Amino acid sequence: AEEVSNKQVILKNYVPKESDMEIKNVTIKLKVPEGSNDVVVKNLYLSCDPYMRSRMRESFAPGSPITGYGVAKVLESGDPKFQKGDLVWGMTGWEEYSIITPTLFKIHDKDVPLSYYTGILGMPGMTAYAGFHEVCSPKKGETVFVSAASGAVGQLVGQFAKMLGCYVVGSAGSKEKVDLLKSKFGFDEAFNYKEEQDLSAALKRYFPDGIDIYFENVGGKMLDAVLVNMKLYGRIAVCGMISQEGVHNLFCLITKRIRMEGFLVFDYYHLYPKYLEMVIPQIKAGKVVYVEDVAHGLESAPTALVGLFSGRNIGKQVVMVSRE
Amino acid sequence: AEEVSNKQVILKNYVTGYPKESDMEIKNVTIKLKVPEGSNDVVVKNLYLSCDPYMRSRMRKESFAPGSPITGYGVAKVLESGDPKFQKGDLVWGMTGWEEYSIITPTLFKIHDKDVPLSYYTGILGMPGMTAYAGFHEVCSPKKGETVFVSAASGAVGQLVGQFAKMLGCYVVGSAGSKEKVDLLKSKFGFDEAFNYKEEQDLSAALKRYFPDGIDIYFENVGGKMLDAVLVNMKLYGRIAVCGMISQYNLEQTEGVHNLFCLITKRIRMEGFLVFDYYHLYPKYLEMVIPQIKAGKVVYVEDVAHGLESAPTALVGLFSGRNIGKQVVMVSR
Numbered sequence: 001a002e003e004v005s006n007k008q009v010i011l012k013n014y015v016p017k018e019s020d021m022e023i024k025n026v027t028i029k030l031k032v033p034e035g036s037n038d039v040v041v042k043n044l045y046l047s048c049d050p051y052m053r054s055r056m057r058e059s060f061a062p063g064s065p066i067t068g069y070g071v072a073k074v075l076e077s078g079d080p081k082f083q084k085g086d087l088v089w090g091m092t093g094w095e096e097y098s099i100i101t102p103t104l105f106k107i108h109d110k111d112v113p114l115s116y117y118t119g120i121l122g123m124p125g126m127t128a129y130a131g132f133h134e135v136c137s138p139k140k141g142e143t144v145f146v147s148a149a150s151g152a153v154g155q156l157v158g159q160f161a162k163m164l165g166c167y168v169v170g171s172a173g174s175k176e177k178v179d180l181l182k183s184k185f186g187f188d189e190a191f192n193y194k195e196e197q198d199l200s201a202a203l204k205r206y207f208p209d210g211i212d213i214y215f216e217n218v219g220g221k222m223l224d225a226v227l228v229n230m231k232l233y234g235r236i237a238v239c240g241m242i243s244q245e246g247v248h249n250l251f252c253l254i255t256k257r258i259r260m261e262g263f264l265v266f267d268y269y270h271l272y273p274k275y276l277e278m279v280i281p282q283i284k285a286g287k288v289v290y291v292e293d294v295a296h297g298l299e300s301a302p303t304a305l306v307g308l309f310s311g312r313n314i315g316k317q318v319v320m321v322s323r324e
Numbered sequence: 325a326e327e328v329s330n331k332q333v334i335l336k337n338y339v340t341g342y343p344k345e346s347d348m349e350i351k352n353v354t355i356k357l358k359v360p361e362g363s364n365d366v367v368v369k370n371l372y373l374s375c376d377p378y379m380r381s382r383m384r385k386e387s388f389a390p391g392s393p394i395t396g397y398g399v400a401k402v403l404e405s406g407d408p409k410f411q412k413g414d415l416v417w418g419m420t421g422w423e424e425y426s427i428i429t430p431t432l433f434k435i436h437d438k439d440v441p442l443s444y445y446t447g448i449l450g451m452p453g454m455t456a457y458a459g460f461h462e463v464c465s466p467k468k469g470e471t472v473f474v475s476a477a478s479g480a481v482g483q484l485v486g487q488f489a490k491m492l493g494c495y496v497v498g499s500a501g502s503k504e505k506v507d508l509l510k511s512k513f514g515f516d517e518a519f520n521y522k523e524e525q526d527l528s529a530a531l532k533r534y535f536p537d538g539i540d541i542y543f544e545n546v547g548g549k550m551l552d553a554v555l556v557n558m559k560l561y562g563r564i565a566v567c568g569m570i571s572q573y574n575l576e577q578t579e580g581v582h583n584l585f586c587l588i589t590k591r592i593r594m595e596g597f598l599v600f601d602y603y604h605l606y607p608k609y610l611e612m613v614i615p616q617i618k619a620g621k622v623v624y625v626e627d628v629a630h631g632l633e634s635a636p637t638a639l640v641g642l643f644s645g646r647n648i649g650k651q652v653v654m655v656s657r
């Protein structure tokens with residue numbers, strides 16, 4: 001068996017600063033632990049996902065590696081479904097090499113950048129598809145509002161909506177991102193939420209006849225502003241509330257007969273092949289695009305993870321652990 | 325044409341905060357009971373009036389007009405009709421005036437079954453019954469064995485929701501605002517458990533005590549702090565049919581709801597509805613429920629105030645829980 005040096009990002013203590021994490025260098029024997037069905041992988045890309053905050057205080061353990069979604073190459077497998085040389089995405093450790101237990105998706109199309117399987121072709125892409133295509137029941141010509149529209153999930157939701165023939169507006173936190181939403185992603189309109197004194201008035205300006213669908217990533221005052229601007233039988237897919245303050249306008253659910261429904265992407269993984277079958281031709285035809293931020297090396301991962309909760313990422317924040 | 329005095333309940337003023345009796349007054353006018361020339365109007369004699377909580381919304385500046393009669397659902401007898409669909413002597417329910425006699429422009433529903441109390445067509449056989457039916461059967465997607473919580477559970481809508489859920493084999497708990505209403509929930513309506521929300525130190529602890537495995541379905545009539553207590557107690561894929569939020573109707577600023585994050589962790593569907601959208605189901609409802617009423621399988625409690633002069637008191641009393649069951653005003657006999 002190969003025995004190799006293995007750099008790891010370790011949680012130093014419960015929580016978010018760089019100094020709450022630590023780089024540790026250990027040795028690993030690259031062998032499937034005896035009698036298990038484990039998979040030994042070399043990690044290529046690691047995703048920085050907002051939900052990781054919840055686990056830093058199902059939680060992570062101080063002294064142990066951070067874990068998250070990544071893209072990896074299989075080195076050894078005790079599981080029939082995976083063999084040496086396979087590329088996979090799934091939960092893995094923040095380290096060069098991980099032993100992953102049976103409790104993980106094989107990658108088949110290598111014609112797109114591999115980092116995409118942390119975003120558009122990974123969990124965030126599946127989240128956008130589940131939330132918009134399944135939860136929202138969208139129809140051509142409907143009006144759609146996306147909060148956190150320039151993030152990994154939101155940038156896809158808006159494009160999926162444009163593909164269906166919807167009118168799409170997005171909210172973002174800077175000029176650079178607002179311009180991106182319109183220039184790159186093809187949103188009909190977008191606005192900087194930080195500049196608006198009255199979010200309700202802002203949405204009225206962009207939606208003179210109201211919002212059919214709100215893809216909710218934010219919550220709070222933004223939700224209150226959406227509620228008063230919804231159309232009859234409007235739908236709200238509750239994906240995240242990254243801002244998280246009391247919500248005051250829920251009476252609008254009755255007068256407008258709104259369905260507001262939360263979901264978790266892992267309930268929808270049985271639809272992943274269907275999602276891929278839709279989105280991969282669209283990527284290859286340049287009809288759906290994706291923007292990510294890629295940091296080089298594990299020694300960059302502490303910086304990359306912290307920077308996520310102030311919107312220092314543009315699209316999905318990724319860490320490249322290794323080239324291949 | 326018959327010429328008669330017509331007492332009316334007038335809205336005096338738009339209302340802020342809680343309504344009081346003095347926000348309304350009784351006026352007497354003379355009118356003639358005649359259909360205006362070439363119109364398709366119906367002249368009726370009002371028999372029963374519903375007091376419904378949504379009327380509070382209409383007291384703000386759709387809304388009522390100060391100086392004019394209050395309007396709402398009632399049961400009436402047709403006296404003259406410019407509409408071929410309605411004949412003298414017909415009994416109807418639908419929107420009418422808070423007065424002895426009204427002129428209507430025909431949905432007015434024609435009542436065919438009078439082997440049930442006519443006052444039932446303000447409640448169980450009228451708009452509240454239909455709300456309970458559509459809200460629970462359609463919006464909640466209920467299944468046998470599920471756990472169900474109903475707020476304002478002894479009221480016109482809630483007392484029916486709990487019975488409908490029991491009939492389906494659900495475990496059903498209700499909250500209400502007095503010992504008398506709690507006893508009624510358990511002894512008359514067949515709720516499995518019920519509690520007085522005013523005597524609970526912590527509503528989320530109270531609900532945890534009644535729903536140790538969580539709540540599959542919340543039929544929401546109250547909003548406010550109750551909704552926040554429910555959210556933290558919902559089961560996975562739980563559903564909330566948002567019917568009303570009466571705890572908010574008299575506030576000049578609503579209370580903030582803080583626990584919506586639970587919609588994500590628990591994958592909850594929270595959906596508002598208006599009974600107005602479900603009237604195509606009213607025949608099905610009436611055909612199901614009337615035989616159940618006549619067979620004593622579904623039961624009802626209404627509170628009948630007597631005379632138009634009692635109507636302001638009956639309406640205002642909804643907001644302090646003075647009604648026991650569906651609040652009705654008997655106009656005539």
Ligand SMILES: NC(=O)c1ccc[n+]([C@@H]2O[C@H](COP(=O)([O-])OP(=O)(O)OC[C@H]3O[C@@H](n4cnc5c(N)ncnc54)[C@H](OP(=O)(O)O)[C@@H]3O)[C@@H](O)[C@H]2O)c1
Binds near residue numbers: 174241263
């Ligand atoms: N339900 C599920 O299964 C599921 C799955 C994956 C993700 N999620 C959730 O979906 C949401 C978006 O995920 P993502 O991966 O697309 O995140 P992302 O790439 O970070 O986009 C999130 C963005 O939200 C904006 N934001 C941050 N703080 C804000 C605030 N206080 N007020 C308004 N906007 C703020 C930022 O962009 P600006 O520059 O525009 O401020 C931030 O970059 C997150 O809440 C995440 O937890 C849910």
Ligand SMILES: NC(=O)c1ccc[n+]([C@@H]2O[C@H](COP(=O)([O-])OP(=O)(O)OC[C@H]3O[C@@H](n4cnc5c(N)ncnc54)[C@H](OP(=O)(O)O)[C@@H]3O)[C@@H](O)[C@H]2O)c1
Binds near residue numbers: 376501505566649
């Ligand atoms: N969506 C629709 O189409 C539709 C149609 C009809 C009715 N509704 C709504 O459904 C709800 C129930 O209507 P209903 O006709 O059955 O009324 P109801 O329950 O017969 O009477 C109203 C009851 O509200 C409770 N209440 C009043 N103030 C409260 C407060 N601050 N906190 C908690 N409870 C309070 C009281 O009972 P306690 O003594 O138990 O406090 C009072 O008896 C109302 O919100 C109504 O607006 C909706």
